[PDB]
């Protein structure tokens, strides 16, 4: 049930089907918490009726946007709006005409997974981290059994809340060291390549937010893979959990796990944490 915006007529149209338009006057912009492609990400609340004020993130499309920019930006809200799942970021709504243009998404107190882990370095148990991976897998299993291919899955694109519940995000707009080989070279983006990218995420998470392949040039990454280079089990990373990364990083995509399977393999691991070795 993933209807693609870009087979639709255009946002406006895509957005109005899939995003609720919110009154600007119920959106309190409290604080800048990033620069985004289009303007500043902020933090704040939204005033829903018969429900205590909800904390939210507010992506802003900066004033003086071309009619081009505006639609590329609201593409995100047309994709996001179609997904219900504990492990995909909830849209609250959007602002498209009349007021400053916004996508109100649910507040994720701990921010992006990659900046979050860098700050909390060594501070989480393998079981805890295996859990953060499970949520990202559950969300990706959903996004898959729904027709959607992410193309840009990374830990910098997973948001953590204040329960360590990780959530797939950044859904626009319809890379090298994240992107599978058959995708880099032949633009063949598929749930298969989203499993190559989940592997890197698994590596990011278990290394507490390192840069994949360190200071290696995008070209050095491409050669290395082509030869058979794969990243190593980071410190304290169990061999089994490291092998799930190798299965994800398999040249021929048909051989890669399914997110259905990644969810179970990780579920065994949490339960009995030794398997992570055996």
UniProtKB/Swiss-Prot annotation:
Which residues are on the Cytoplasmic side of the membrane? 1-275
Q: Where can this protein be found? A: Cell membrane
Q: Where does ATP bind?
A: 33-41, 59
Give all residue intervals belonging to the Protein kinase domain.
27-270
Q: Which residues carry this modification: Phosphotyrosine?
A: 2, 8
Where does the entry say this protein is expressed, by tissue?
Widely expressed.
Q: What residues sit in the active site? A: 152 (proton acceptor)
* The record's account of how the chain is modified after translation: Phosphorylated.
Q: How is the quaternary structure described?
A: Heterotetramer upon binding of the ligand. The heterotetramer is composed of an ephrin dimer and a receptor dimer. Oligomerization is probably required to induce biological responses. Interacts (via PDZ-binding motif) with GRIP1 and PICK1 (via PDZ domain).
Q: Which family does it belong to?
A: Belongs to the protein kinase superfamily. Tyr protein kinase family. Ephrin receptor subfamily.
Role summary: Receptor tyrosine kinase which binds promiscuously GPI-anchored ephrin-A family ligands residing on adjacent cells, leading to contact-dependent bidirectional signaling into neighboring cells. The signaling pathway downstream of the receptor is referred to as forward signaling while the signaling pathway downstream of the ephrin ligand is referred to as reverse signaling. Among GPI-anchored ephrin-A ligands, EFNA5 is a cognate/functional ligand for EPHA7 and their interaction regulates brain development modulating cell-cell adhesion and repulsion.
Q: What is this protein called?
A: Ephrin type-A receptor 7
Q: Per the UniProt entry, what species is this protein from, by scientific name? A: Homo sapiens
Lineage, highest ranks first: Eukaryota, Metazoa, Chordata, Craniata, Vertebrata
Section covered of the full-length record:
607 to 899 of 998
């Amino acid at each position: 049930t993933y209807i693609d915006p870009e087979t639709y007529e255009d946002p406006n149209r895509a957005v109005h089907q899939f995003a609720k338009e919110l009154d600007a006057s119920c959106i309190k912009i409290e604080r800048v918490i990033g620069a985004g492609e289009f303007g500043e990400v902020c933090s704040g609340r939204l005033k829903l009726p018969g429900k205590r004020d909800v904390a939210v993130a507010i992506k802003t499309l900066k004033v003086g946007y071309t009619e081009k920019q505006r639609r590329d930006f609201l593409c995100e809200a047309s994709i996001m709006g179609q997904f219900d799942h504990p492990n995909v970021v909830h849209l609250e709504g959007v602002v498209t005409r009349g007021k400053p243009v916004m996508i109100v998404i649910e507040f994720m107190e701990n921010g992006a997974l990659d900046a979050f882990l860098r700050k909390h370095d060594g501070q989480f148990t393998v079981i805890q981290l295996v859990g953060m991976l499970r949520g990202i897998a559950a969300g990706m299993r959903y996004l898959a059994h729904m027709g959607y291919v992410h193309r840009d899955l990374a830990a910098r694109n997973i948001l953590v809340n204040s329960n360590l519940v990780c959530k797939v995000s950044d859904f626009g707009l319809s890379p090298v060291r994240w992107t599978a080989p058959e995708a880099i070279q032949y633009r063949k983006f598929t749930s298969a390549s989203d499993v190559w990218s989940y592997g890197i995420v698994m590596w990011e998470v278990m290394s507490y937010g390192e840069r994949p392949y360190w200071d290696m040039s995008n070209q050095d990454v491409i050669k290395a893979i082509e030869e058979g280079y794969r990243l190593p089990a980071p410190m304290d990373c169990p061999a089994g959990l490291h092998q799930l990364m190798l299965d994800c990083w398999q040249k021929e995509r048909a051989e890669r796990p399914k997110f259905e399977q990644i969810v179970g393999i990780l579920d065994k691991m949490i339960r009995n944490p030794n398997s992570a070795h055996h």
